[PDB]
């Protein structure tokens, strides 16, 4: 599987206001038409902070048609400069 567009998650307002960094690791599948599928959250730091923004964004992610895969894993890091 190769990525074609992976729209960036928004930085949660509470996290930016409290100067909080972290990360979320995601696992999902890649359909024949380049749709992202069966999204799970494998780990998240800190808990109850970044998940919803990741899941939202991932709805829009598009990959290459057509080479599917099963547990494709992406780690997403949230940083404040």
């Amino acid at each position: 599987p190769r990525a074609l567009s992976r729209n960036q998650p928004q930085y949660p307002a509470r996290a930016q206001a409290l100067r909080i960094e972290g990360q979320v690791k995601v696992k999902f599948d890649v359909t024949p038409d380049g749709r992202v599928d069966n999204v799970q959250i494998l780990s998240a730091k800190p808990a109850n902070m970044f998940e919803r923004e990741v899941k939202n964004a991932m709805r829009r992610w598009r990959y290459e048609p057509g080479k599917p895969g099963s547990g494709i894993v992406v780690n997403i890091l949230f940083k404040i400069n």
Binding site: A17, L77, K79, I80
Partner: peptide, 18 residues
């Protein structure tokens, strides 16, 4: 696994109503 990196946009002022 690929790593994506999300950096806080400095031009956003979040409110103190978190």
């Amino acid at each position: 696994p690929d790593t994506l990196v999300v950096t806080a946009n400095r031009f956003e002022q979040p409110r103190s109503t978190v």
